[PDB]
Write a protein that binds this DNA or RNA. Structure first.
Lengths: 461, 374, 182, 516, 166
RNA sequence: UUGAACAGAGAGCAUUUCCGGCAGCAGAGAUUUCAGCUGU
């Protein structure tokens, strides 16, 4: 009779030399591993609880802030850690966000500096030294656009006349500014929107639809010759710089405070307006928004895109900011602070990992876009654990017990009470429109994505 | 764990190697448990290059068994499926992992290079170029890697431009060992010899000289002298003029012994103008070396170079027609030397007589030679 | 059991492998360590009787404060427990809830009586001596540690005659009279 | 990609008894591709499996397998396995209930009299020998060799690694059967009271008290698949219990008389129950069919056990008898005791042994080795059973070579991923799904408006009333069943219009009868 | 982008290749500041691609004086020309991380396609490789680095002070 | 902004241009592997 038993042999399972690790034999039988749904449910629940205890999003404020509340912010789209901010008392500052300290400050204007951006100024007589000088220009309500250079310690190649290399001049005030991402060009909105270049001391072209003023401006990031602007007649106007002309405008219900273009989709933009939500619009069809981001409770002051194009940040007049996944339409996250008042400017840093907010008490604050995410480099075991936990929270996302935990935040008292009376108001109007629809004959079902456009020039067929 | 990743990367080749009916499941489980042992020893702690080497030897043995079993079972020499390159690719990756972990044993680096070269048509010479590039980056001072790199790319591929670039970069890195200098003058003489032999061959079927070798000879003398005077008397120059002249004399002895070796292994290149190419080293050594090699000490070296300049046409066989042509040149050399020297006169006379007697009916013409050099 | 890190101790706070809430702080173990109680179930056998006394004391304090039934039975139970020795004072009736206690019933055990009468240097020595059969109450030898000694019955706790311990204390003071064997 | 052993690694799913969305269509196509890739690559690991299972095979027709002696096995197998086949002769305390840790490293024996010893049976290291002089009944490890629970005269006690008493449980009044649920950290307790108690060992909290309502619990086993408890009563009834429902999940009528023993396969598919009516019965668990009914055993089977490779070890007093491939569907796998004339379609015993002096107390297979530890009246005996253990364990579920640091970190990690006691269901894959209420099509709010519309117009369309139909034998007409199932004294508008539509139906049936 | 790293040390020159960038904006945070102390995470940032050792203590003292007064020596020229790719001089230079802001100009004077960075990111990368030292080099140098440090410090000091033994 | 020749990198993308078929033969290195001509 042949016969054979289990010969475990102890050389394959506990190692000979003491310096090396023990063997881990695997056996992928589901008989060996029994509770495959419950075990990863509890791992997804422990991941959501670990996220809710690791959510420490406030990095730090930078510097000492300003004196009179930050109303303009501009990142530069080529360096990771440099940031220009301007306040109401005319002072602008250039910031190193690594050390959280200003390269330089500038008493730029006398009024409010109402816009500022950054440039690589293509002069055709001089050569731009972009490895030691940074350039920011800035418009105010004292009818001036000024262009400044900054001494920057980022390369150590060299070894110098920092401020105010030139002063463009308008006859009326300015209200917004944004620079083209090539070809020495910028545009300033104000009493009317002008286009400029850094060589000529006067506007190249006036590109105004009608005699109604312009409140904001953004250039496109790819297809760089497409401008967009917000006018105080609740209007959003697109301009093209091939045709050197406006292109199409829409009139909404309330006033668009800001625009930002999608850096990864080149025809989509997001508007941030005074009814308390944001609108994701396609340039090729402005007859309908392709999303509405709804969760704010007062007027949305500024919006910005992640450089990955996958989520937006959105600061509003209720003293809180909100981060939104682009495909959802409700807030993924809310950041607030008892010290932060009336966040007027929000940018999304080029790392896609930090969020810069300028409030109006004076302070500019860094936040993490993902609160539970730390910025060290990770060994492969902890990186694998973190993305395993992300995939697991993703596929158990809608279970009631982990949804009530991942959904949870502490919102201030004012925003919570405004939220619940907003809920009972919306439920009341849905009740009344359901009754009215039960009776009356032809009540059209208007979409939420169309419920906020009062009209559109150049009708669609 | 990463042993799990590597072990389940090993499974498609044995899928294919069981489907092609040469191995069975019970023997491929045995090669997997041996390979499990080896992968765990590789990527655990306390690892050794001998663990890498034994894994490479085991994988080569199962490759040879796979080839033998293929020829015996399927009676083809390759199944043109996955299981005839996957195992050599595995050996190449074990080598790459080992050289990334322990980049310090040139035995393992050279086993990598030998297996990669001997893999044949299936490898790529740019794949050999990559591991030559990273090995020369890690060991720039080790000079045999520069010689081996340039030897592979001249004695196999015949790439003269890249070979010149390799030798110039190596001489940029360590311009201190004379071995790289000698292999560079050897390469330049081999290149110019192949150039003039392809000229002779195109003539026989149907300007650019050894002055390259003389110029690199000149910079060889200059930089080897500079590096020996900088190497010895190391920290400072705190040494009085006795020790400075002692040092400078010794560097002249060092450099001139290396040029003696240069002419000694220079004579065997006799397909170019060997007389001109040795006489230019003679005239480059004949000049002043700033510490009176002729007019003071190293007079034995002056006598050695005088004997070389005398026999520089008499480098001949026992058929001594050149001696019967220009032995009066050697007599005038001995007369011009003994017109000045005192004991080197008798030394050079006895040495030239002993050299001509040792090197040179046939004894009757040799009796004429003995009467001449008596 | 491995001194959890901060995220683990925050994530599983109620985990404890030793101290549970049904344990009641290990007080059976605590007072049986104090009074050196052999078997595990003596604490709970005494706890049943303390619960009887306190259940009757509750249900008897829930009577009206002036009737002679309540006053007679409260005084009668108070007298019985003082005479037995569990209660140390028969004055106030809040002793029938507060001062009635397994430790009081355990202080009345034979080795504790012994140790307080200076008859052994510790309670474990007293346990060893009455296990070895040196101690008699009255005439008859008492052999087990759990024997409860009332107030009038602690006057007769002595050693047996022909005890080696009795012999060595008498011969320490050299009052040993070998006529009566010690 | 084909993988001859995929259906072990396959995973069942929900079925209804394709889409127009482009993004959802491609998402489901990616999900099906990933499921197929994952099943195939997970099933290709059987090359990487290090060891092979044991066996013994007859190689002749005169050589039967049940007549192979344990000394002959110990001569035929190696010295390490022959030394694992231990035998402790502990005569003075009672019959020894045996228990192994879930990796086979530690052994926990209990004498009936008082002698409980936890030990490393394969080294010579005992780490607790405590003589609790009241009659102990059973014990189990909790999550380790570091804690064990013993069921004493009445109360269940919990002891640490070296044997100091940690806990006396004031509940668990008379346990006779303890079993630990290791993924849920639950000590489960049943006995002479008709109560089943689940006690969380980590927090310390009594999770559940359930009335069996069927007298003392005669047998008890745990499904390793879904952690439901099969208790066997004096009715001949097995009942499957969970700590959520205060009623048994299922009640099966296994035997006549009482139920002496229950064992469950580790795949959670088969259950062998022995009754006191000399009847072994193999049960399907998932579909609750009765696979085999071996009636008229020569003496009642006092124990059953099922190995990790599916052997069936029955014990009838002095005798231990093991059958191979008995837990299968076909009638040729019914375990016989002889093959009448050499029938190959009769499952004769795989091996048998006779403990000639005594009567065995319990059976337990050693987890990852080829041994069967039977505890009997004079101590412990391991039997070398060659087909009887998972040769290829997973070393990150539970490791027989695990060190002290690995024990510490695995204890903290399994404590962290402890499953809640509410997730115990009859099937484990029912905690990701949706309700079996809450309609299987998701609703798009147009139909919610439509549902509220017909809820407004339930009156005057009678959509909440049975429809009028005359030809349906009006003694069972639906409308009169409404009228009779309602309470016969209240009057609401719903039942008034049912009475109206019933009179309409009676008049239509009257005129149809008249024209017929 | 901090693509390459130049670490000077008494045994020779080392060129490292930066695998993963550390955070720029979160560079003052606690985890980013102590990942350069943990070696298991620093080896995720820095990989050694080249090490040219010196010819002896004489060339060590020559290169110590050249590194001290901020000049590119010939061994520096050799190792940088071996290791750094031929980038453009007008568009996207290759980025070398040094620790000496007045050695940078001497590096761009010799290689115009190299922009040099010594700010706080390059400083803590440099002090990470200083903190770990012999572990990064994988065994490829002769001579213990602290013994060569003792010799080079004594030689540098006696040179700088003109210590005569007469 | 384009064009030109030059110097290259291994860091991308095709496709039927050949080879990973067989001998005869000489050559190469330490009895195994390596290197080209005339046809299948």
């Amino acid at each position: 009779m042949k016969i054979k038993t289990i010969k475990r042999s102890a050389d394959d399972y506990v190692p000979v030399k003491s310096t090396q690790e023990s063997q881990m034999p695997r056996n992928l039988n589901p008989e060996l591993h029994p509770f495959e749904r419950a075990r990863e449910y509890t791992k997804a629940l422990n991941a959501t609880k670990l996220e809710r205890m690791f959510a420490k999003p406030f990095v730090g404020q930078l510097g000492y802030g300003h004196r009179d509340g930050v109303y303009a912010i501009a990142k530069n789209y080529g360096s990771l850690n440099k940031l220009a901010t301007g306040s109401a008392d005319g002072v602008i500052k250039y910031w190193n966000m690594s050390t959280r300290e200003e390269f330089v400050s500038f008493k730029a204007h006398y009024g409010l500096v109402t816009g500022l951006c950054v440039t690589q100024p293509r002069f055709h007589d001089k050569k731009p030294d972009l490895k030691s000088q940074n350039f920011m220009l800035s418009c105010s309500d004292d009818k001036t656009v000024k262009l400044w250079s900054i001494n920057v310690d980022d390369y150590s190649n060299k070894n110098n006349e920092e401020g105010l290399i030139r002063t463009f001049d308008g006859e009326s005030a300015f209200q917004g500014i944004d620079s083209h991402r090539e070809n020495s060009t910028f545009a300033t909105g104000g009493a009317k929107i002008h286009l400029w270049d850094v060589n000529r001391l006067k506007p190249v072209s006036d590109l105004s639809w009608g005699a109604d003023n312009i409140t904001s401006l953004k250039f496109n990031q790819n297809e760089t010759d497409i401008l967009a602007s917000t006018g105080s007649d609740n209007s959003i106007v697109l301009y093209d710089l091939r045709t050197n002309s406006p292109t199409q405008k829409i009139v909404q219900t309330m006033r668009t405070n800001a625009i930002c273009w999608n850096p990864m989709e080149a025809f989509n933009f997001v508007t941030a307006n005074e009814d308390h939500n944001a609108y994701y619009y396609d340039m090729r069809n402005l007859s309908r928004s392709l999303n509405v981001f709804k969760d704010h409770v007062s007027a949305v002051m500024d919006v910005d895109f992640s450089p990955t194009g996958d989520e937006i940040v959105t600061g509003s007049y209720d003293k809180s900011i909100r981060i939104y996944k682009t495909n959802h339409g409700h807030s993924r996250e809310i950041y607030h602070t008892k010290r932060m008042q009336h966040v007027f400017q929000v940018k999304y840093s080029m790392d896609s990992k930090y969020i810069i907010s300028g409030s109006d008490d004076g302070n500019v604050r860094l936040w993490r876009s993902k609160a539970w995410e730390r910025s060290n480099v990770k060994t492969t075991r902890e990186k694998n654990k973190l993305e395993y936990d992300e995939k697991l929270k993703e596929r158990f996302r809608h279970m009631p017990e982990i949804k009530r935990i991942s959904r949870h935040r502490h919102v201030p008292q004012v925003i919570k009470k405004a939220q619940e009376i907003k809920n009972i108001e919306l439920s009341s109007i849905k009740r009344r429109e359901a009754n009215e629809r039960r009776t009356r004959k032809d009540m059209p079902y208007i979409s939420e994505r169309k419920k906020q456009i009062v009209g559109t020039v150049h009708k669609y067929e | 764990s990463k042993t799990r990743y590597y072990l389940e990367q090993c499974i498609p080749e044995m899928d294919d190697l069981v489907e092609k009916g040469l191995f069975t499941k019970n023997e491929v489980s045995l090669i997997m448990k041996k390979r499990t042992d080896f992968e765990h020893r590789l990527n655990s702690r306390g690892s050794s290059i001998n663990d890498y080497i034994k894994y490479i030897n085991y994988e080569s043995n199962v490759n040879k068994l796979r080839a033998k079993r293929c020829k015996r079972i399927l009676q083809v020499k390759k199944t043109n499926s996955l299981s005839d390159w996957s195992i050599q690719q595995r050996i190449g990756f074990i080598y790459q992992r080992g050289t990334n972990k322990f980049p310090q044993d040139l035995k393992f680096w050279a086993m990598y290079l030998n297996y990669m070269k001997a893999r044949g048509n299936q490898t790529s010479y740019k794949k050999i170029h990559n591991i030559y590039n990273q090995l020369l980056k890690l060991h720039p001072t080790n000079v045999d890697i520069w010689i081996s790199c340039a030897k592979y790319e001249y004695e196999v591929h015949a790439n003269f431009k890249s070979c010149r670039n390799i030798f110039q970069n190596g001489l940029r890195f360590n311009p201190d060992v004379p071995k790289l200098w000698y292999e560079y003058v050897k390469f330049e003489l081999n290149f110019i010899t192949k150039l003039i032999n392809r000229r002779k061959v195109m003539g026989l079927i149907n300007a650019l000289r050894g002055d390259i070798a003389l110029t690199i000879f000149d910079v060889c003398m200059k930089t080897l002298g500079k590096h020996y005077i900088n190497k010895h008397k190391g920290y400072y120059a705190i040494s009085d003029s006795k020790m400075n002249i002692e040092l400078n004399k010794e560097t002249l002895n060092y450099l001139f012994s290396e040029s003696l070796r240069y002419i000694k292994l220079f004579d065997e290149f006799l397909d170019l103008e060997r007389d001109y190419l040795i006489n230019h080293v003679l005239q480059f050594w004949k000049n002043d070396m700033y510490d009176l090699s002729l007019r003071k000490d190293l007079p034995e070296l002056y006598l050695k170079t005088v004997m070389i300049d005398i026999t520089l046409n008499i480098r001949y066989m026992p058929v001594e027609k050149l001696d019967i042509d220009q032995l009066q040149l050697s007599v005038k050399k001995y007369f011009a030397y003994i017109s000045k020297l005192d004991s080197a006169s008798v030394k050079s006379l006895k040495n030239e007589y002993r050299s001509y007697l040792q090197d040179n009916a046939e004894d009757d013409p040799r009796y004429k030679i003995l009467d001449l050099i008596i | 059991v491995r001194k959890l890190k901060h995220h683990e101790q925050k994530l599983l706070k109620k985990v404890d492998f030793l101290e549970w809430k049904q344990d009641q702080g290990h007080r059976d173990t605590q007072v049986m360590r104090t009074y050196h109680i052999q078997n595990r179930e003596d604490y709970h056998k005494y706890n049943r009787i303390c619960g009887d006394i306190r259940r009757l004391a509750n249900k008897l304090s829930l009577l009206p404060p002036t009737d002679p039934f309540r006053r007679k039975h409260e005084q009668l139970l108070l007298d019985k427990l003082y005479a037995m020795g569990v209660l140390t004072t028969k004055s106030k009736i809040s002793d029938l809830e507060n001062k009635v206690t397994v430790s009081a019933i355990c202080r009345r055990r034979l080795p504790v009586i012994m140790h307080r009468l200076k008859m052994a240097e510790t309670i474990q020595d007293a346990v060893k001596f009455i296990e070895q059969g040196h101690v008699r109450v009255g005439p008859n030898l008492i052999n087990d540690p759990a024997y409860l000694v009332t107030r009038n019955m602690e006057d007769y706790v002595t050693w047996v005659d022909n005890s080696k311990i009795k012999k060595t204390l008498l011969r320490y003071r050299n009052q040993i009279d070998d006529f009566d064997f010690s | 990609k084909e993988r001859e052993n995929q259906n072990k690694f396959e995973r069942s799913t929900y079925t209804n008894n394709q889409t127009k969305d482009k993004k959802l269509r491609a998402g489901l196509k990616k999900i099906d591709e990933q499921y197929k890739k994952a099943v195939s690559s997970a099933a290709a690991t059987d090359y990487l499996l290090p060891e092979s299972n044991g066996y013994l095979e007859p190689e002749n027709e005169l050589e039967k397998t049940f007549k192979v002696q344990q000394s002959e096995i110990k001569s035929s197998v190696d010295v390490s396995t022959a030394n694992k086949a231990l035998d402790l002769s502990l005569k003075e305390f009672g019959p020894y209930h045996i228990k192994y840790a879930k990796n086979g490293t530690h052994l926990l024996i209990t004498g009936r009299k008082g002698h409980v010893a936890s030990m490393d049976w394969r080294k010579g290291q005992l780490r607790a020998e405590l003589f609790l002089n009241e009659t102990c009944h059973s014990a189990t490890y909790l999550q380790n060799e570091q804690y064990f629970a013993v069921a004493q005269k009445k109360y269940t006690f919990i002891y640490d690694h070296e044997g100091t008493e940690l806990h006396r449980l004031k509940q668990h009044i008379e346990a006779r059967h303890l079993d630990f649920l290791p993924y849920h950290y639950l000590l489960v307790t049943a006995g002479e009271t008709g109560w089943l108690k689940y006690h969380d060992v980590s927090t310390g909290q009594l999770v559940s008290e359930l009335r069996t309502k069927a007298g003392p619990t005669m047998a008890m086993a745990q499904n390793p698949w879904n952690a439901v408890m099969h208790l066997g009563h004096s009715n001949g009834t097995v009942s499957l219990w969970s700590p959520s429902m205060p009623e048994p999940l299922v009640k099966l009528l296994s035997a006549r008389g009482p139920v002496n023993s229950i064992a469950i396969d580790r795949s959670g598919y088969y259950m062998a129950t022995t009754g006191a009516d000399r009847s072994m019965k193999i049960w399907d668990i998932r579909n609750f069919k009765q696979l085999h009914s071996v009636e008229s055993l020569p003496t009642p089977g006092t124990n059953v056990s099922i190995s990790d490779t599916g052997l069936l070890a029955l014990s009838r007093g002095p005798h231990v008898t093991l059958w191979k491939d008995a837990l299968k569907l076909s009638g040729d796998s019914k375990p016989c005791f002889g093959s009448m004339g050499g029938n190959p379609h009769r499952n004769t015993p795989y091996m048998s042994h006779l403990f000639a002096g005594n009567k065995v107390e319990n059976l337990g297979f050693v987890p990852f080795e080829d041994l069967l530890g039977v505890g009997h009246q004079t101590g412990i005996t391991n039997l070398i059973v060659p087909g009887a253990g998972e040769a290829n364990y997973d070393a990150l579920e539970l490791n027989p070579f695990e060190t002290k640091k690995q024990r510490q970190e695995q204890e903290v990690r399994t404590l962290l991923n402890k499953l809640p006691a509410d997730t115990i269901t009859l099937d484990p894959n029912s905690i990701g799904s949706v309700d079996k209420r809450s309609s299987t099509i998701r609703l798009n709010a147009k139909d919610l408006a439509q549902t509220t519309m017909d809820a407004n117009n339930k009156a005057k369309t009678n959509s909440d009333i049975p429809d009028v139909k005359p030809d349906v034998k009006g003694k069972n007409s639906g409308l009169r069943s409404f009228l009779r199932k309602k309470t016969q004294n209240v009057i609401d508008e719903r039942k008034l219009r049912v009475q109206k539509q019933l009179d309409k139906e009676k008049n239509i049936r009257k005129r149809n009868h008249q024209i017929k | 982008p901090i693509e390459y790293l130049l670490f000077e040390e008494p045994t020779g020159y080392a060129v490292f290749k930066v695998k993963l960038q550390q955070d720029d904006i979160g560079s003052r945070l606690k985890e980013v500041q102590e990942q350069i102390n943990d070696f298991g995470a620093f080896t995720k940032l820095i990989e050694l691609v080249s090490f040219a050792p010196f010819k002896g203590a004489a060339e060590a003292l020559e290169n110590a004086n050249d590194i001290s007064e901020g000049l590119v020596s010939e061994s520096l020229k050799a190792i940088l020309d071996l290791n750094l790719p031929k980038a453009s001089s007008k568009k996207k230079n290759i980025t070398l991380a040094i620790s000496d802001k007045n050695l940078g100009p001497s590096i761009k004077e010799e290689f115009p396609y190299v922009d040099c960075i010594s700010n706080e990111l390059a400083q803590d990368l440099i002090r990470g490789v200083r903190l770990h030292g012999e572990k990064l080099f994988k065994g490829l140098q002769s001579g213990d680095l602290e013994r060569a440090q003792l010799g080079l410090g004594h030689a540098y000091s006696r040179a700088k002070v003109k210590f005569s033994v007469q």
